[PDB]
Amino acid sequence: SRRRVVITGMGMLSPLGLDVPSSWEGILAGRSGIAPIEHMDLSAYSTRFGGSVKGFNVEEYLSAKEARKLDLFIQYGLAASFQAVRDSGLEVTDANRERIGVSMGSGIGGLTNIENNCRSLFEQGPRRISPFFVPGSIINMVSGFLSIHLGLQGPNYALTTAQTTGTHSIGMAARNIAYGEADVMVAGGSEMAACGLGLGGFGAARALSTRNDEPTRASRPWDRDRDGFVLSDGSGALVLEELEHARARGARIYAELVGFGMSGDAFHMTAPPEDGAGAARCMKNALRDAGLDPRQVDYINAHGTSTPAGDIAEIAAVKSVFGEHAHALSMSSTKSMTGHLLGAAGAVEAIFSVLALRDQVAPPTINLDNPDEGCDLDLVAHEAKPRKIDVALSNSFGFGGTNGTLVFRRFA
Amino acid sequence: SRRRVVITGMGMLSPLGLDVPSSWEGILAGRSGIAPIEHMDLSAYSTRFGGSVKGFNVEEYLSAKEARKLDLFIQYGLAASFQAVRDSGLEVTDANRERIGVSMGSGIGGLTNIENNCRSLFEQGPRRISPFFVPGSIINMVSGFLSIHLGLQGPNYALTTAQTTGTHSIGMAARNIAYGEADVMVAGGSEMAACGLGLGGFGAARALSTRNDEPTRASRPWDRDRDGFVLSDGSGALVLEELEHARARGARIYAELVGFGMSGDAFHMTAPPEDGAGAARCMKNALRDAGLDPRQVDYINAHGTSTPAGDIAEIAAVKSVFGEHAHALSMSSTKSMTGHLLGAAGAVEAIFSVLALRDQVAPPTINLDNPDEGCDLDLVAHEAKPRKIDVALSNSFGFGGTNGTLVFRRFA
Ligand SMILES: [K+]
Ligand SMILES: [K+]
């Protein structure tokens, strides 16, 4: 009924590194990538730190002339995409390019570019807007430009499901491959909302931590002194591949993507329900899609955003799905270190989940000094935990109560 | 292998009407919905007309208090969604709500809201941004709020593939139902980019017609004196339903959704290739997905945007897919009347395609006074053409060279 889908390539920019292996070394070491933001003047803002991408040089991937039309969220998406296509060793030919596509998305897209063109329009009027504004700032153009730069002719689209984007992108790209619409898909997410509208919009909603004096401690999922999420930038991308197609060309396979689930809370615009019953259904859907019993799960990479309401819902949902086995699995939030990459969070965390399968180690939940009422599971507090990981889950639960769960598994 | 998917409900706001049947009466009569734009001062702009939604009253759907947080693209999406859920006669219960989802998207989303919050931020600083800015302006919240207002717990996501959004949303929602992930999906698209950044961004790219003296004549697909697309607002939404589920409750079925195809040009950021070879592959994929031979197609609702390069590519692609039969089918662009609803274009045109199957009539391509070189097919110039329509196709081809084709068919 379904062809099998594996991960043959990965790419990343995060607040911990300009590629995957540098970012992952950071994760394993408990390193925070959070810091006061240098690129702009945040003095008037109630929050002043974030996970920024540091030292990014777009001209590793594109000429200065190409790069200049494109919002940072696009540059970030192409870079992760390029890394991953490279990482995969895939050679794109006339014989396969119609079988290779792209699903790279974003939660908010080109907010920086829109900001800047907004300034021009207000001060100098319509004619000063760039002619590349639209193509260089709408969300589908990570997918757009990547297909052009790589001559990829397969399914070409983009999701935008806020903080769940990255997770849904990967899952539905795998469904493209399982359905026969593609053999290969580049999927993932990118974001750069660290601009005045991003930080101010999230500040206005009071959704962000305001621990300005100690930014590396701001993101503390399941800690009783948590005060909101930490906004972060970057991108993740995976090369998904039908199993036989990868065997045929001798691909290195990191892991198998076995399950994808989805759900809606149908509850509230920004807050999850106390019992996490939407997240519970999503994980259950993802497990059944993988043909798995809850007891076969060894590691969960949580959404774990460091909001009061969400961290606790996620515990409820895990306890209700997994029962007693909730105490045997390890769950951690690597947002404790990376911050919340929004639409890219799902993508980088899928990659963290795959790496956790490769190296048999559960990354840590840093800053988990005083676990709140109920937060009594193995949350890998403080430091990496080597252990058996056969099956690894990655959740994302975003505004609009939109939920997504991926299930990965060691390959053989 | 696949469950069968039918259309049981439809909703719409367009520049021709505040619902489906008013909009469709306009279409059949050759009525243009294009007019100089009243809602803002366009004097400094090189284009000054558009397809606006006229007389919209959001309080038919939501309280003033609800409505006020939400960008117009969201209001427009919920309204079409509500219409269509209503139109369908579906009763949402605890027994089915986990089987009912939403895929409603947009190409650019809340550009108006972002504009306004941009002004506040510039003049008055961060603290003046609304706390509802983010939830009320990001694209996934049509889906978000609809699932909350209707208690829908099934798959919840949103696409953003620019001018192809509406087409992809519907196609992938049908795939949700064919796969077993849902029995029912509300899918479609909404847009309101008629704000300074929209009109100015598209003006800066020189992509818009500038026929300000005669706006009802600006949109003239395949006419030799065409000078770019006409920007338009609104929304379409369809209730997709597994076939047995609809039979079981005695649903009225408009038509069957039998095919969905996708492709990438991999060519250019904004311009299609001269031969339309990407669009050709997309239609071919869509036909094969439907189990259909080209000769079985009676009517095509074209992308037909009134750009020089795109209108002509689409002819090339149709001639190459359909061969001699290209001269027996009828193709028309209802953008001649509606203008280009961008991310909603696909959604309203899917609805036009379904209505064309219901009433056995091909809508007209208005303004097609002098067909360009090569534009010698039956393009239903000027006035509606009653005829046999068993099978109807709807194309969309958007920036990034992203392509989508839907195939509908009379039900029995
Ligand atoms: K996660
Ligand atoms: K169309």
The string of DSSP codes covering B55-115 is: S--GGGTS-HHHHTTS-HHHHHHHHHHHHHHHHHT----TTTTTSEEEEEE-SS--HHHHH
Phi-psi region of A265 (alpha: psi -120 to 50; beta: other; left: phi over 0): alpha
d(CA A405, CA B128): 36
For residue B266, the SS3 value is coil
Nearby residues of A57 by Cβ (< 8 Å), 6 or more positions away: none
d(CA B224, CA B240): 38
Q: Where are the alpha helices (DSSP H) in A125-207?
A: 141-150, 165-179, 196-204
Question: Encoding tokens for residue B10?
Answer: 């439809």
Cβ B386 vs Cβ B265: under 8 Å: no
Per 3-state DSSP, what percentage of chain A is helix, strand, and coil (rounded to 5)? 35, 20, 40
Query: What's the N-to-C CA distance of chain A in angstroms?
Result: 19
Phi-psi region of B192 (alpha: psi -120 to 50; beta: other; left: phi over 0): beta
Question: Encoding tokens for residue B230?
Answer: 């006409």
Closest residue in B to A147 (Cα) is: B266
- Ordered structural domains, chain A, with CATH: 6-259 (3.40.47.10), 260-412 (3.40.47.10)
Question: Encoding tokens for residue A311?
Answer: 């961290």
Question: Encoding tokens for residue B233?
Answer: 């607002």
Contact across the interface for B400 and A154, Cβ inside 8 Å? no
Burial class (CB within 10 angstroms; exposed 0-12, middle 13-18, buried 19+) of A213: exposed
Nearby residues of B76 by Cβ (< 8 Å), 6 or more positions away: B13, B53, B56, B190, B191, B192, B233, B234, B235, B344
Phi and psi at B391, nearest 5°, equal -135, 130
Burial class (CB within 10 angstroms; exposed 0-12, middle 13-18, buried 19+) of B291: exposed
Distances (CA, A) of A277 to A58, A274, A317, A392: 42, 8, 6, 20
Q: Which residue has the tokens 């060793």?
A: A89
Pairing mode, strands A100-105 and A156-157 = parallel
Q: Which residue has the tokens 């003047």?
A: A41
d(CA A231, CA A163): 11
Contact across the interface for B402 and A206, Cβ inside 8 Å? no
d(CA B232, CA A131): 19
The bound ligand whose nearest atom lies closest to the alpha carbon of B167 is 2
Burial class (CB within 10 angstroms; exposed 0-12, middle 13-18, buried 19+) of A29: middle
Tally of CB atoms within 10 A around B131: 15
State which H helix or E strand residue B143 sits in.
Answer: helix B141-150
> Strand order in B234-242's β-sheet?
B156-157, B100-105, B184-191, B234-242, B5-13, B255-264, B402-409, B391-398, B299-301, B330-332
Q: Which of A105, A159, A268 has its CB closest to that of B148? A: A268
User: How close B173 gets to chain A, by Cα (Å)?
Assistant: 11
- Comparing CA positions, the residue from A102, A106, A110 lying closest to residue A82 is A102
For residue B270, the SS3 value is coil
Question: Encoding tokens for residue A123?
Answer: 């001060």
Question: Encoding tokens for residue B252?
Answer: 């009225």
Phi-psi region of B411 (alpha: psi -120 to 50; beta: other; left: phi over 0): beta
Question: Encoding tokens for residue B134?
Answer: 């983010």
d(CA B117, CA B113): 6
Q: Which of B130, B147, B151 has its CB closest to that of A400? A: B147
Contact across the interface for B101 and A264, Cβ inside 8 Å? yes
Closest residue in A to B132 (Cα) is: A205
Buried-exposed string A125-141: b where 16+ CB fall within 10 A, e elsewhere: ebeebbebbbbbbbbbb
> Residue B262's beta-bridge partner residues?
B404
Cβ B162 vs Cβ B201: under 8 Å: no
Tally of CB atoms within 10 A around B309: 15
Question: Encoding tokens for residue B90?
Answer: 């579906």
d(CA B143, CA B377): 39
Cα A346 to ligand 1 centre (Å): 6
Question: Encoding tokens for residue B167?
Answer: 């087409």
Q: Which of B126, B153, B398 has its CB closest to that of A200? A: B126
Please tell me what resolution, in angstroms, this structure has: 2.4
Tally of CB atoms within 10 A around B73: 31
Chain A residue numbers with beta carbons less than 8 Å from the beta carbon of B122 are 118-119, 122
| Experimental approach | X-ray
Cβ A242 vs Cβ A3: under 8 Å: yes
Cβ A316 vs Cβ A276: under 8 Å: yes
Contact across the interface for A200 and B129, Cβ inside 8 Å? yes
d(CA A74, CA B204): 20
Q: Angle formed by the axes of helices A111-124 and A196-204, to 10°?
A: 100
Q: Which of A125, A145, A159 has its CB closest to that of B400? A: A145
The sign of the dihedral angle between the CA atoms of B303, B307, B309, B315 is positive
For residue A47, the SS3 value is coil
The sign of the dihedral angle between the CA atoms of A213, A214, A219, A221 is negative
